[PDB]
Amino acid sequence: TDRVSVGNLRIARVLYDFVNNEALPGTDIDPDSFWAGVDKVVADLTPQNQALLNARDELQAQIDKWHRRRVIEPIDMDAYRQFLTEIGYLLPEPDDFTITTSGVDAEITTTAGPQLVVPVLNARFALNAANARWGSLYDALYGTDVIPETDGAEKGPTYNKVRGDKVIAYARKFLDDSVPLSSGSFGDATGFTVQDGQLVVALPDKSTGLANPGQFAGYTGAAESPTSVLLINHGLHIEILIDPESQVGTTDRAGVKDVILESAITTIMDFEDSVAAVDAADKVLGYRNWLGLNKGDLAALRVLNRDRNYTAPGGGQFTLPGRSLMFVRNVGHLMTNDAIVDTDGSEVFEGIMDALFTGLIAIHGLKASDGPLINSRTGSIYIVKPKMHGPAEVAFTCELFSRVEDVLGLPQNTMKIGIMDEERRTTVNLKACIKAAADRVVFINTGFLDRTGDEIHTSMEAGPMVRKGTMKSQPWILAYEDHNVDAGLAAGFSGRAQVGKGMWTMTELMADMVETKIAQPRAGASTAWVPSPTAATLHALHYHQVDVAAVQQGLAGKRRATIEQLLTIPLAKELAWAPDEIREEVDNNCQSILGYVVRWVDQGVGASKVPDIHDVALMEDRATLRISSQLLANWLRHGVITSADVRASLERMAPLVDRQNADVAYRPMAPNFDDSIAFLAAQELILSGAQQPNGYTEPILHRRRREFKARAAE
Ligand SMILES: O=C(O)C(=O)CC(=O)c1ccccc1
Ligand SMILES: [Mg+2]
Ligand SMILES: [Mg+2]
Ligand SMILES: [Mg+2]
C-alpha cells in the first residue's frame, strides 16, 4: 500500500525515503529518533490545531448571525465592537513591551531593502532568486518599460544605442542622487581612481571626491585604474563596473559597463500560496529544492553564487554575501495532506509536517556546503508562518517550533518566525500576536491580498462589498497598513526586526512600480515584496531615495489608526453601479479565476501571469484567487448578480483563457464545460465560496487537483 508504519503514522514511501536518504544524512540526527519525534509531535499537537480551526468556524458563525440579525441601516460601530469583545474575537491590548529575539542576521535587523518571494517547486526560479542579492541596473532598465519605448528608443532583436544611452543617463542621475559628488555630476565623469584610500572622480576640467567620503566602500583591481568601485548608501551597496573594452563601456564617457545594485536582500522560498503541492510526490519535489538550496548544490549548469571579493578603501581585503538570505514560507494551520495518514486513514496537518521537514532541511544551511555555510551565520532558521488568526494561533506556532527544535536537537528559539498580518483577527489583536512570539519574531508583513479576502469573508453577511479595484483605497486597508507599522515600531522593531509590506503584482508595469512602490519605504516599511529579480533591482532604487531608518525614528510613538477605522466594513452604497460596471467586474473576476485555476488544477502551477480584462499581466497566486472568488460569492449572496450571470461569464471567459494558453500540456476547457475538472473547480470556488472556511481556496483546489491526477493516472 506504498506506506511506512511509524507508531500511529503511515508515511508515503517517497517521503520516508527522501527524509532518510537525503534530508537526514549530515545533520547527525538519528533516523529512528527523528521519526519517533514526528509521531510524538503529531499526536500531541493535532488536538490543539483542530480546536483552533473549530474556534475560527464558531466565531464566523456568530458574526454571520449577528449581521443577519441587523435591522439597521448604518452599522452601529459601538455595538459591533462590544459584540466582538464579548465573543472573544477582540482581545484586550497587552502593556507596552520590546521584542527579545536574538541571533538574527544583519539583513533582517538592520538592512532596509527588497524581499523576493518565489515558488520553491521551480528550481530555476529558486536559483535566480537566491542569486538576486546582486542585480544589473542596466539590464533592469533596458529590459523593462522604465525606459519608455518612444520613437527611437524601442527594443529590437539587436542592441539599440539610443535606448542604451537613456539607460546610461538614468543610472548617472541615480548615482548623483544617491552618492553625490563634492562638485559636478557623474554624467560628466571620465574616470575613477583610488588615491590615499579616497575615491577620486575625474571630470573634464577638474577632479572631485564624494560629498560624503564614507560612501566609498571599496573597489576591485588596481587602485590607479579600478575594475570596479563599490559604494554604499542607506546600507545598500552599489557597484560601478569599469570596463572600456566592453560594447557598452566603449560608448561610455568613463568606460562604465554597468551599475550593479544590492537588490533582493532576503528571499522567501515559498511552500504556500505560489505552489500547488497536493500529495507526497509534490511535497518531496519542494523539499528537495529547499534541501539543494541549503546544501548549496541545487543546480539547473546554473548554480548558487559565491561571496564577492573587494579591496577596502585602505587596501586590505573583505567579502560581501553573494546570495540572498533565505526564509522558507511554510503552509498555515488549515490543511491536511495525505503524505502522512494516521491508522484511521485521517490525513496529518500540513503545517505540523512543514515545521518538521523544512526545519530539518534548514539545518544544512547552518553548516559548510560543497565551501562556506550557505545561509545564517548567526545560527537562526527563518520560517514565515502565514494565515494565522489571532494570538492563540501565534502561541501554537511557537509551541510547535519549540517541540520541533527538541526533535531536531537544536537550541530553543533557533526557529524564527516571520508573522504575516493577513487575517482580520490578527490585525485587530496585532500587539498580542507579536507578544506571543516576542522571542522568535523576525518580521511582520501586511499580506494585503489575503487580508482583503478575509475582510470580504468575515463580513460576507453584512451586504454587497465594493468592487475589487476600490478595495486598495478603502478606510479599513489604509488603517490596517498604518496600524501594522505602528505596532511593529512600538514593539521595538527598529534595529531588531523587519516591518514589511506587500507584493507588486503588475509584472510588466515597471515604470508604474518605480513611480508608485516608493510609498512603502516612505511609510516606514524596512522591506516590501517583489515578484522577480528584475523587480528587486528596480525596487532597490526606492531604498536609496528614502532613508527608512530616519522615517521609522520619526514615526516613533504615533498611533495613527483606531480600532473603529480597522473595523470599517467595505460595504458598497445603494445604487453604486450601472449594468456595464457590474458586467465588467464579473467578467474580470471570472477571467482572473479561470486563468489561474486552469493552470493550478491541470498542470500543478501555483503562480501564473494572467492578463486581466484590461490586458494587464498580473502575477496570480491563491490570495488573488481568494479575493476574486469571495467578491463574486458576496455579490451572488446579496443579489447584485444572478447564478445565470456567473455561469454565462465563466462560459464566455473560458474560450479566452483557452486562447491565451494554447501551449503543449494544456487541455482546453470549452466547449465540454461539465467534463473539465478545471472549469468545475473555478465554478465551485464561486458557488461554494460563502461556505469555504474563512473563504480559503485550498480545500477545493487540492480536491480538484487530486481528482485531475487520478483521471490522468487511469
Ligand atoms: O498578500 C498576500 O496575502 C501575500 O501572502 C502575497 C503573496 O503571497 C503573493 C506571492 C506571489 C505572487 C503574488 C502574491
Ligand atoms: Mg452559514
Ligand atoms: Mg498571503
Ligand atoms: Mg540619505
C-alpha span between 234 and 236 (Å, rounded): 6
B/e letters for 421-432, b = 16+ CB within 10 Å, e = fewer, are bbbbbbbbbbbb
**Whether the Cβ atoms of residue 548 and residue 527 lie closer than 8 Å to each other:** no
Residues in the chain: 714
Q: Let me know the angle formed at the C-alpha of 611 by 472 and 385, rounded to the nearest 5 degrees.
A: 55
Q: Let me know the angle formed at the C-alpha of 356 by 352 and 357, rounded to the nearest 5 degrees.
A: 115
Chain centroid to CA 285:
20
Q: Which residues pair with 381 in a beta bridge?
A: 415
Chain centroid to CA 690:
26
Q: Work out the burial of residue 443: count CB atoms within 10 Å of its CB; fewer than 13 is exposed, 13-18 middle, 19 or more buried.
A: buried
Residue 426 phi, psi (nearest 5): -80, -50
Three-state secondary structure call for residue 377: coil
C-alpha cell at 602: 491541470
Which residue minimizes the CA distance to atom 14 of ligand 1?
621
C-alpha span between 236 and 230 (Å, rounded): 10
| Spatial CA neighbour of 573 closest among 464, 483, 496 | 464
| Spatial CA neighbour of 468 closest among 227, 336, 632, 329 | 632
CA of 82 to the centre of ligand 2 (A): 22
106, 331, 340, 354, 633 from 278: Cα distances, Å: 36, 12, 12, 13, 25
Find out whether the beta carbon of 607 lies less than 6 Å from any atom of ligand 1. yes
62, 296, 307, 671 from 694: Cα distances, Å: 13, 38, 44, 33
DSSP class per residue in 342-372: ETTSPEEEHHHHHHHHHHHHHGGGGSB----
How many of the other CB atoms lie within 10 Å of CB of 219? 25
Of 272, 328, 449, the one to substitute when testing ligand 1's pocket (max ligand atoms within 8 A of C-beta) is: 449
**Residue ranges of the chain that CATH labels 3.20.20.360:** 1-133+263-572
Tell me whether strands 415-421 and 381-385 are parallel, antiparallel or unpaired.
parallel
Ligand nearest to the CA of 58: 2
Q: Let me know the angle formed at the C-alpha of 9 by 7 and 11, rounded to the nearest 5 degrees.
A: 125
> Would you please indicate which residues are annotated as catalytic (active-site) residues?
329, 621
How many of the other CB atoms lie within 10 Å of CB of 113? 28
C-alpha span between 376 and 371 (Å, rounded): 14
Ramachandran category for residue 444: left, alpha or beta (phi over 0 → left; psi -120 to 50 → alpha): beta
DSSP class per residue in 171-214: HHHHHHHHS-BSSS-GGG--EEEEETTEEEEE-SS-EE-BSSGG
Find out whether the beta carbon of 443 lies less than 6 Å from any atom of ligand 1. no
Find out whether the beta carbon of 419 lies less than 6 Å from any atom of ligand 1. no
**Whether the Cβ atoms of residue 235 and residue 504 lie closer than 8 Å to each other:** no
Q: Is the peptide bond before 321 cis (omega within 30 degrees of 0)?
A: no
**Whether the Cβ atoms of residue 181 and residue 210 lie closer than 8 Å to each other:** yes
* Neighbouring C-alpha atoms within 13 Å toward the C-beta of 478: 10
Of 384, 600, 621, the one to substitute when testing ligand 1's pocket (max ligand atoms within 8 A of C-beta) is: 621
CA of 574 to the centre of ligand 2 (A): 24
C-alpha span between 668 and 626 (Å, rounded): 23
The DSSP 8-state label assigned to residue 531 in this structure reads S
Mark out the alpha helices in 390-532 (DSSP H runs).
391-408, 424-427, 430-436, 448-458, 475-490, 510-516, 519-522
Find out whether the beta carbon of 654 lies less than 6 Å from any atom of ligand 1. no
The DSSP 8-state label assigned to residue 26 in this structure reads T
Find out whether the beta carbon of 465 lies less than 6 Å from any atom of ligand 1. no
C-alpha span between 82 and 184 (Å, rounded): 63
**Whether the Cβ atoms of residue 152 and residue 162 lie closer than 8 Å to each other:** yes
How many of the other CB atoms lie within 10 Å of CB of 292? 20
The residue to which cell 453604486 is assigned: 576
How many of the other CB atoms lie within 10 Å of CB of 154? 11
Q: Let me know the angle formed at the C-alpha of 375 by 133 and 399, rounded to the nearest 5 degrees.
A: 120
Find out whether the beta carbon of 455 lies less than 6 Å from any atom of ligand 1. no
Find out whether the beta carbon of 449 lies less than 6 Å from any atom of ligand 1. yes
C-alpha span between 623 and 185 (Å, rounded): 45
C-alpha span between 228 and 194 (Å, rounded): 11
The residue to which cell 573634464 is assigned: 204
Find out whether the beta carbon of 623 lies less than 6 Å from any atom of ligand 1. yes
Q: Is the peptide bond before 107 cis (omega within 30 degrees of 0)?
A: no
Atom number, ligand 1, closest to the C-alpha of residue 448: 1
C-alpha span between 270 and 262 (Å, rounded): 22
C-alpha span between 389 and 351 (Å, rounded): 14
Max Cα distance, the chain (Å): 84
**Residue ranges of the chain that CATH labels 2.170.170.11:** 134-262
DSSP class per residue in 654-702: HHHHHHHH---S----SS-GGG-HHHHHHHHHHHTGGGSGGG-SHHHHH
Which residue minimizes the CA distance to atom 8 of ligand 1?
273
CATH of domain 1-133+263-572: 3.20.20.360
C-alpha span between 193 and 318 (Å, rounded): 19
CA of 545 to the centre of ligand 4 (A): 7
C-alpha span between 107 and 109 (Å, rounded): 6
Ligand nearest to the CA of 608: 1
State whether the Cα torsion 419-424-429-430 is positive or negative: positive
The residue to which cell 506556532 is assigned: 397
292, 409, 666 from 30: Cα distances, Å: 21, 10, 45
C-alpha cell at 139: 539590464
The residue to which cell 456567473 is assigned: 646
Backbone interruptions in the chain following residues (C to N > 2.5 Å): 300, 370, 662
Residue 67 phi, psi (nearest 5): -70, -35
Q: Let me know the angle formed at the C-alpha of 185 by 183 and 189, rounded to the nearest 5 degrees.
A: 105
| Spatial CA neighbour of 263 closest among 240, 239, 241, 236 | 236
| Spatial CA neighbour of 472 closest among 510, 507, 520 | 520
Tell me whether strands 236-242 and 256-262 are parallel, antiparallel or unpaired.
antiparallel
Helix axes 280-295, 123-130, angle to 10 degrees: 30
Q: Work out the burial of residue 638: count CB atoms within 10 Å of its CB; fewer than 13 is exposed, 13-18 middle, 19 or more buried.
A: middle
C-alpha span between 280 and 16 (Å, rounded): 10
Find out whether the beta carbon of 450 lies less than 6 Å from any atom of ligand 1. yes
CA of 435 to the centre of ligand 2 (A): 33
C-alpha span between 27 and 25 (Å, rounded): 6
How many of the other CB atoms lie within 10 Å of CB of 92? 9
Which residue minimizes the CA distance to atom 6 of ligand 1?
447
C-alpha span between 537 and 546 (Å, rounded): 15
Beta strands, E only, 288-362: 308-311, 317-320, 325-329, 336-342, 347-349
C-alpha cell at 108: 533582517
C-alpha span between 441 and 102 (Å, rounded): 9
**Residue ranges of the chain that CATH labels 1.20.1220.12:** 573-714
CA of 417 to the centre of ligand 3 (A): 15
Find out whether the beta carbon of 453 lies less than 6 Å from any atom of ligand 1. no
Q: Let me know the angle formed at the C-alpha of 299 by 293 and 302, rounded to the nearest 5 degrees.
A: 115
C-alpha span between 204 and 193 (Å, rounded): 15
CA of 500 to the centre of ligand 1 (A): 12
3-class secondary structure per residue, 109-131: HCCCCCEEEEECCCHHHHHHHHC
- Give residue 380's identity as a one-letter amino acid code: S
Atom number, ligand 1, closest to the C-alpha of residue 624: 14
CA of 421 to the centre of ligand 3 (A): 9
Helix axes 677-687, 643-661, angle to 10 degrees: 140
DSSP class per residue in 457-472: HHTGGG-PBPPGGGGG
- Give residue 586's identity as a one-letter amino acid code: V
Q: Kindly indicate whether the domain formed by 573-714 is annotated with CATH number 1.20.1220.12.
A: yes
265, 283, 331, 452 from 276: Cα distances, Å: 26, 9, 11, 22
CATH superfamily of this structure's domain 134-262: Malate synthase G - maily-beta sub-domain (2.170.170.11)
CA of 532 to the centre of ligand 1 (A): 13
Q: Let me know the angle formed at the C-alpha of 322 by 254 and 618, rounded to the nearest 5 degrees.
A: 90
Instruction: List Cβ neighbours of 578 (8 Å cut-off, separation of 6 or more).
Output: none
C-alpha span between 161 and 316 (Å, rounded): 39
Of 273, 457, 620, the one to substitute when testing ligand 1's pocket (max ligand atoms within 8 A of C-beta) is: 273
List for the chain the helix, strand, coil content (%; round to 5). Answer: 45, 15, 35
| Spatial CA neighbour of 654 closest among 639, 641, 667 | 667
The DSSP 8-state label assigned to residue 363 in this structure reads G
Q: Which helix (H) or strand (E) holds 606?
A: none
Find out whether the beta carbon of 505 lies less than 6 Å from any atom of ligand 1. yes
Atom number, ligand 1, closest to the C-alpha of residue 273: 8
